[PDB]
From TrEMBL, chains A, B:
Segments traversing the membrane: none
The protein's name: Mucin-like protein
Disulphide linkage map: C70-C167, C138-C143
Keywords: Metal-binding, Signal
Record: residues binding Cu(2+): H1, H96
Residues of the full protein shown: 24 to 196 of 320
Organism superkingdom: Eukaryota
Tagged with keyword Metal-binding: yes
GO MF assignments: metal ion binding
Organism this protein belongs to: Phytophthora sojae (strain P6497) (Soybean stem and root rot agent)
Length: 173, 173
């Protein structure tokens, strides 16, 4: 659960930290065998190479199983100035395994195969900070930050994928 | 397949009738279970209201799943004078169902839910003519015409959406 809090998104309705969708793993495999995050991430790594995976954005964009574009955030909201310290900040700590990435228009500016282990300490209470994030490519006149996170979890023995997506319009830098 | 031929477009590379993207339907539905172009249009109409649809431009602009702005046409191409007869002419007949629209800068000057039935006869050989089109709003010093068409078709039983986009720079009246 969670959303990018800085820079600050607008909301189609109200603020929520919920996932866009929660679905069965879209690639057949031994997901349910894993007792913990290490196993899930290993399965993801192998099965993604079996399924022509590139990145989370290429996986989700254009496929309605992953739910609506931009999730609960509003791409048409008033654009905000990005942070000046080369970061983005999450609304909470990252407590699920799985890959995440930040895009500024068509440029991927941050990516990790396991955002949980890279940007927080795995607890909810320590706020996750994404870094480095270079906003310098943001077109004058403005650009769209997009966050994508595919959380992998085994929920009482049954593995699910959750898709988290934010769109956050920025002013040019 | 096709492009607005009058007024005359310029091309990033070479003239092409092709679609910008071909994607699965972006709204989950009974596309494949319906019959004929009429079934595609009735599904589109009903799912439109489920998915907050306004118009084709609003669907496509700012969403990379619908591919690059202006498609294969060049917005930095040669400015051309608009037709004097209150029409735009396509490069061929229109042989796929679905909505299309013409814009002059931020003004929508023509929209139809099914360009196939409104502007041609369903065959490639009867040149489609869009009408009525009023070019009188074109700023002195120029405007940009934009054409948007979301084609709906079944390809060996599997429904796809295709995006066609043109931009054509016009001289001012
Ligand atoms: Cu969660
Ligand atoms: Cu075609």
């Amino acid at each position: 659960h969670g959303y990018i809090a800085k820079p600050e998104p607008s909301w189609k309705d109200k603020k929520t930290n919920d996932w866009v969708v929660e679905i069965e793993p879209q690639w057949k495999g031994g997901w349910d065998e894993s007792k913990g995050d290490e196993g899930l991430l290993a399965t993801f790594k192998e099965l993604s190479a079996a399924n022509n995976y590139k990145d989370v954005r290429s996986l989700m964009d254009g496929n309605p199983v992953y739910g609506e574009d931009c999730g609960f955030t509003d791409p048409k909201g008033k654009p905000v100035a990005p942070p000046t310290d080369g970061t983005a900040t999450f609304s909470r700590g990252i407590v699920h395994a799985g890959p995440c990435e930040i895009w500024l228009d068509d440029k991927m500016v941050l990516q990790n195969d396991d955002c949980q282990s890279a940007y927080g300490d795995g607890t909810q209470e320590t706020i996750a900070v994404f870094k480095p994030v270079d906003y310098s490519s943001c077109a004058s006149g403005g650009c769209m930050l997009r966050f994508y996170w595919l959380a992998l979890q085994r929920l009482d023995g049954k593995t699910v994928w959750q898709a988290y997506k934010n769109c956050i319009p920025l002013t040019g830098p």
